[PDB]
Structures are given as structure tokens and as C-alpha cells.
Ligand binder design. Structure first.
Ligand SMILES: Nc1ncnc2c1ncn2[C@@H]1O[C@H](COP(=O)(O)OP(=O)(O)NP(=O)(O)O)[C@@H](O)[C@H]1O
Ligand SMILES: CC(=O)N[C@@H]1[C@@H](O)[C@H](O)[C@@H](CO)O[C@@H]1O
Length: 355
């Protein structure tokens, strides 16, 4: 948006300083995020993506419930800055906008620099699972249906493939055939949720590493952000998605595949932190599926990148025409290595579950 438009939006909110700038900020793919600089405090301004989250009222109800529950336990979280009339968000000229306080003195990572950082991530999301267990499913309505319903995602992928709107399929047959060949593997968690062998839990559902802000001095997790997808699911969605993003030796959009590897050392570090917090609640069946949850969420995310490529990049923000194909390729490479290391990761979980 133009400066005039953005400064107008900012005037709707109860900011505590004169605005000096509003500039696009961050590595988010979904909403449109801006850093608001003032003569004092900083803020994050977001235009919510209503094509992805059409029910803005229900989304903000969830975010308000979660954050207010955290605040009422004295725990740092996203602090909604209300409109000047007290609302949690504003509809302005056909757009939905919200503001959060900028969480100060933090660092975050798109790539794990050392195992200790990833262990801390495990602890943070493991702790968040315990926190979320205080809610029953009925209090937090789904903001996106079938969100980690991988067979449903696969139906969407197949439709995108058959349509082949842009004629992009010709150049990515190996990637396409990887997802088609693994069709048999996509239902394991959904089947377990449906038959009761996997507990339905309230989960975060987007547990990539850069959704944890860590303190710049202590290195400890300060807050979990990106709260839009909190809804019922399986623990395995949170665990798997964390491994997908954070157990890689490379960025999600690394162009050089020779740099992309699945690290069992990082897998171990995360699992130590995560299971360390959840040892009391994790069932036998959940533990059995911990390694495969990595494969599953990486395949789901990968297929979603490739479907989006085939559809002309309507879902995820991209920086260049082939960006989503570059992204799907890293996810495939990762899964190829998770398959190769399946015995090793099984052993890691068993070791941790005992000691
Ligand atoms: N309250 C905050 N304080 C400081 N930084 C923030 C805050 N909220 C968001 N950010 C930063 O802005 C980035 C994008 O925000 P986020 O809410 O993850 O965007 P999104 O597009 O809605 N979802 P995603 O594509 O999953 O990252 C984050 O990675 C952080 O760097
Ligand atoms: C609401 C939504 O679709 N969020 C997605 C998440 O599912 C996906 O795993 C990630 C990939 O980087 O990007 C976004 O955060």
C-alpha cells in the first residue's frame, strides 16, 4: 500500500507515539506485515488475508481468547493494540487490519544456528501444547477447514494438477510424481484421529522456528507468535511441522539442493525439548508416529507449495515466478533423507522416551 493509505490505517489504532514510518516487514507468506516506527514505541501492522481467513470475526475471537488467557497467567504473548474505539481489529475500505505491540529485545531464526536453539524451540512448543490443553475443542473454532487433513490437501493437489492452469506441469514431472507415489501415506494421522487411537488436542498448527521470538540476551523463548491457526488437531501436526522447517540444514527456499539435508542431530535436540515438556501426556501411538510426522507434514507442505505453483501462486507470497517450485524441491529432498534415516530417528525417539 501507499504511505498515505498506511498512515491512514494507523490512525485508526490506539498508538502511543507519532508515526514516522510504516514499512513492509518480515518473512511471512500469508498476511501482509509492516513495521510501524514512531517517536517512541514500535508496532506491527498487519492486513489480514481474507481469502485465506474469510471469517475475520471468528479468527480474532480465537486470537483474543488465547492471548487473554496467556495474559491472565502473566505470560508474554501477542498484545493486540485496540482501535481508538476499543475493537480488536478494523475493517477499513474493504480490508481487515490489526496491530500488535512490537515484541522488543528479541531475535528469531529461519535456520537453526546450533542445537541449543532448536532444543529451546522444542521446549517452547512443548510448553505451548500443555498450555493449549487447558482449552476444550469447542472454545476454538477452526479458522481454516481441513488444515492438516493431508488426504484433503492431496485432493486439492490432484485438482490443481489436472487443471494445469499455466502449463507449468510439464517442467515438474519428478516433483509431481513424488507426491502422487506417496498417496498411500497421507491418511495415517487423520485415520487415527477418526478412530480415537490418536487424541484430538488443541494445537498451534504452524510451528515453524521463526514463530518463536527468543530473548536477545538469555536465549530463552519469549513469545510464540503467528497464532492464527490455533484449533483442534494432533500433537503430531505441531511436532512434524517443527521438524520440517527446523531440522533442515537449509532455508525453505534454498535453490542449491546440495545444501539441503535432514539433520538427525537437530531432530534429537528438538525432541529432547518437546518430549521433555510433554512426557506426561504423550501416548504410545503418538510416540510411535513422531518420526513419520516429520515426513507427513513435510509432504503436506511440499504438496501445497507445488499445487500453488501449478495454480499460479495464489496462496503463498512469492518473490519470483519459480519460487514455489524451489520451495517444493527442498521439502522433497528433506523427505528423501527422512526416509533414509527412519531407523535412526525411531531410535532417537525410543532413547528419549526412556531417559
Ligand atoms: N508482535 C510482534 N513483534 C515483533 N515481530 C513480529 C510480531 N508479530 C510478527 N512479527 C514479525 O513479523 C513476521 C511475520 O509475522 P507472521 O504473523 O508470522 O506473518 P503471517 O504472514 O501472518 N504468517 P507466516 O507466513 O506463517 O509467517 C514474523 O516472522 C516476525 O518477524
Ligand atoms: C495459514 C497457513 O497456510 N500458514 C502456512 C503454513 O501452513 C505453512 O507450513 C508455512 C510454510 O512456510 O507457511 C504458512 O505459515
Amino acid at each position: 500500500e501507499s504511505n498515505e493509505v498506511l498512515f491512514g490505517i494507523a490512525s485508526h489504532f490506539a498508538l502511543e507515539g507519532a508515526v514516522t514510518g510504516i514499512e513492509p516487514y518480515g518473512d511471512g507468506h500469508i498476511n501482509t506485515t509492516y513495521l510501524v516506527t514512531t517517536d517512541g514505541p514500535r508496532y506491527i501492522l498487519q492486513q489480514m488475508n481474507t481469502s485465506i481467513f474469510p471469517d475475520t470475526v471468528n479468527l480474532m475471537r480465537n486470537v483474543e481468547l488465547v492471548t487473554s488467557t496467556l495474559k491472565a497467567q502473566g505470560k508474554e504473548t501477542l498484545d493486540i493494540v485496540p482501535t481508538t474505539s476499543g475493537a480488536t481489529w478494523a475493517e477499513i475500505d474493504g480490508g481487515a487490519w490489526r496491530v500488535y505491540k512490537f515484541i522488543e529485545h528479541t531475535v528469531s531464526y529461519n535456520l537453526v544456528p546450533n542445537p541449543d536453539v532448536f532444543r529451546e524451540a522444542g521446549s517452547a512448543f512443548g510448553d505451548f501444547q500443555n498450555f493449549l490443553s487447558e482449552f476444550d475443542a469447542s472454545q476454538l473454532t477452526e479458522t481454516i477447514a481441513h488444515f492438516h487433513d493431508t488426504p484433503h490437501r492431496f485432493e486439492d493437489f490432484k485438482a490443481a494438477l489436472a487443471a494445469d492452469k499455466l502449463g507449468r506441469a510439464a517442467a515438474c514431472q519428478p516433483e509431481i510424481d513424488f507426491y502422487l507415489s506417496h498417496a498411500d501415506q497421507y491418511a495415517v494421522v487423520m485415520d487415527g484421529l477418526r478412530d480415537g487411537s490418536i487424541p484430538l488436542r488443541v494445537t498451534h498448527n504452524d510451528t515453524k522456528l521463526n514463530n518463536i521470538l527468543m530473548d536477545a540476551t538469555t536465549g530463552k523463548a519469549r513469545a510464540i507468535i503467528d497464532l492464527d491457526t490455533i484449533m483442534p488437531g494432533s500433537m503430531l501436526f505441531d511436532f512434524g511441522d517443527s521438524i520440517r522447517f527446523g531440522a533442515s540444514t537449509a532455508l525453505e527456499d534454498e535453490k542449491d539442493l546440495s545444501k539441503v539435508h535432514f539433520s538427525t542431530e537437530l531432530f534429537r535436540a528438538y525432541t529432547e525439548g518437546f518430549v521433555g515438556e510433554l512426557r506426561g501426556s504423550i501416548t504410545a501411538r503418538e510416540a510411535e508416529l513422531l518420526p513419520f510426522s516429520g515426513n507427513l507434514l513435510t509432504m503436506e507442505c511440499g504438496m501445497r507449495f507445488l499445487a500453488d505453483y501449478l495454480e499460479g501462486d495464489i496462496y503463498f507470497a512469492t518473490k519470483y515466478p519459480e519460487h514455489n517450485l524451489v520451495r517444493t524441491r527442498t521439502q522433497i529432498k528433506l523427505v528423501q533423507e527422512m526416509e533414509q534415516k527412519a531407523s535412526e530417528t525411531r531410535a532417537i525417539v525410543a532413547d528419549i522416551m526412556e531417559a
